[PDB]
From a paper:
Type IV pili (T4P) are thin and flexible filaments found on the surface of a wide range of Gram-negative bacteria that undergo cycles of extension and retraction and participate in a variety of important functions related to lifestyle, defense and pathogenesis. T4P filaments are produced by the polymerization of pilin subunits in a process that depends on PilB, a hexameric ATPase associated with the bacterial inner membrane, while pilus retraction is powered by another hexameric ATPase, PilT. In Xanthomonas citri, two cytosolic proteins, PilZ and the c-di-GMP receptor FimX, are involved in the regulation of T4P biogenesis through interactions with PilB.
Native and selenomethionine PilB12-163-PilZ complexes were crystallized as described in Materials and Methods, in space group P21. Initial phases were estimated by single wavelength anomalous dispersion. The asymmetric unit contains two copies of the PilB12-163-PilZ complex (chains AC and chains BD) and the overall structure of the heterodimeric complex is shown in Fig 1G and 1H. PilB12-163 is made up of two sub-domains, a four helix ND0 (α1-α4) and an α/β ND1 (a β1-β3 antiparallel β-sheet surrounded by three helices (α5-α7) and a string of three consecutive short 310 helices (η1-η3)). The most significant difference between these three PilZ structures is that the electron density for the last 11 PilZ residues (residues 107–117) is well-defined in the PilB12-163-PilZ complex, while no density is observed for these residues for PilZ alone and in the FimXEAL-PilZ complex. These C-terminal residues (called motif V, or MV) are highly conserved in X. citri PilZ orthologs, including PilZPA2960 from P. aeruginosa, and are required for the interaction with PilB but not with FimXEAL. Specifically, in the PilB12-163-PilZ complex, the carboxylate group of the C-terminal Met117 residue of PilZ makes a salt bridge with highly conserved Arg103 of PilB while the Met117 side chain fits into a hydrophobic pocket made up of PilB residues Leu72, Phe77, Leu100, Phe101, Phe108 and Ile134 and conserved PilZ residues Phe28 and Trp69. In both GspE-GspL and EpsEND1-EpsL structures, the PilM homolog (GspL or EpsL) binds to a surface of the PilB homolog (GspE or EpsE) which we name the PilM interface of PilB. Importantly, the PilM interface does not overlap with the PilB surface to which X. citri PilZ binds (called the PilZ interface in Figs 2E and S13).
Residue numbers in the entry:
A (entry chain A): 11 to 157
B (entry chain C): 7 to 117
Write the structure that this text describes.
Amino acid sequence: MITGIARRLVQDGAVEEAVARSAMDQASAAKVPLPQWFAEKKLVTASQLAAANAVEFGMSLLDVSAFDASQNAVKLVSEELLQKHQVLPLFKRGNRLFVGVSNPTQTRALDDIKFHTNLVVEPILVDEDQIRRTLEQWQASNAALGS
Amino acid sequence: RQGILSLALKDKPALYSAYMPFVKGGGIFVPTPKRYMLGDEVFLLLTLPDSSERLPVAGKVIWTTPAGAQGNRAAGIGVQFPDGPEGEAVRNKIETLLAGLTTSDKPTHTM
């Protein structure tokens, strides 16, 4: 029976019932979390998977195309970490750094940033497409400042 | 209220928690248990602390936090102010009221 984000993707109309079952059974056989499997296999669009992830995982979701690039916090995360992981550092508030992730089940990436920054790291969902494009966009805007 | 949200902000702390300074054009967080999708067009009636005027904001959803979210984070939607004189006016009043408070360390409804 169809549970988790697989069920939510059905209720959202993003995927067929039998495809959701087959994905779910496959992920279970691989011992891989459902959102990771769905992203890897591209069963639905990134924004659809982000939408189902947000409601089922209880997480906030940001359209970063409306974020003011000039307020990004990319420079708090080293170039190495930004290629090791596929995350989009967003914005700092006090001892908190909000980090865009597209997989609700990142741990290494958030913990690495936690150790590198000595900040408290809060994940915010951002769909996988936007993280790819926007990180590059924001690196270009940061570079225009110099260095 | 058939697709018309409303938000009344009675003091400066309420406005601080609601305001979204990193949104292009400005944005405002509106508590609601209804699930919205990023990109949805919404109409908001926004009351600010300085007066009883209800400000019409025809904006786009750029942020969602779901019902039963992980922590003490309120369910609702972040609404981008539209391009145009009506939107910039709203942003301008807000940024005056919160002067020196936006780079505060105090947590908001969003970030």
